[PDB]
Amino acid sequence: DSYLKHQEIVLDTLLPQTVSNQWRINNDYIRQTCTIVEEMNIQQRKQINDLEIYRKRL
Amino acid sequence: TSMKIQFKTAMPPTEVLLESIQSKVESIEQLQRKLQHVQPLEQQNNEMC
């Protein structure tokens, strides 16, 4: 019964090492997720400005 | 008479075992269940990894 206790804790040890590492993946991509949305926004902000500038220029 | 003697001496020893082991087999068989759910939780998270 003590043998089954020491065998069981190793899997719940392996339950942490994946769960900490998989959120260490998603923590990095979210920073990349917010950077591209920042650069795409200034792209879209400059896009709608030029579409209305050239109409006012003509 | 061996069915008289040997069967009832085992029935006395098995119920003396049933007082002491059948509490701890339920402690063992449910600690087995702690492995078999932690096994399928570990497989899906290494997939998620």
Secondary structure string (H, E, C) spanning A3-17: HHHHHHHHHHHHHHH
Contact B32, A4 (CB under 8 A): yes
Contact B32, A8 (CB under 8 A): no
For residue A2, which amino acid is it? S
Q: What is the DSSP letter of A49?
A: H
- Residues of A with CB below 8 A from B34's CB? 8
User: Alpha-carbon distance B21 to A17, whole Å?
Assistant: 35
User: Would you state the structure tokens that stand for residue B33, as one six-digit string?
Assistant: 């269940």
∠ CA(A49), CA(A50), CA(A56), 5° rounding?
A: 90
Contact A13, B36 (CB under 8 A): no
Contact B24, A1 (CB under 8 A): yes
Residue from the list B27, B34, B49 with its beta carbon closest to the beta carbon of A8: B34
Mutate to test the interface with B, among A18, A26, A28 (most CBs of B within 10 A): A18
Q: Rg of chain A over CA atoms, in angstroms?
A: 26
Contact B28, A2 (CB under 8 A): no
The resolution in angstroms reads 2.5
User: Would you state the structure tokens that stand for residue A27, as one six-digit string?
Assistant: 């923590």
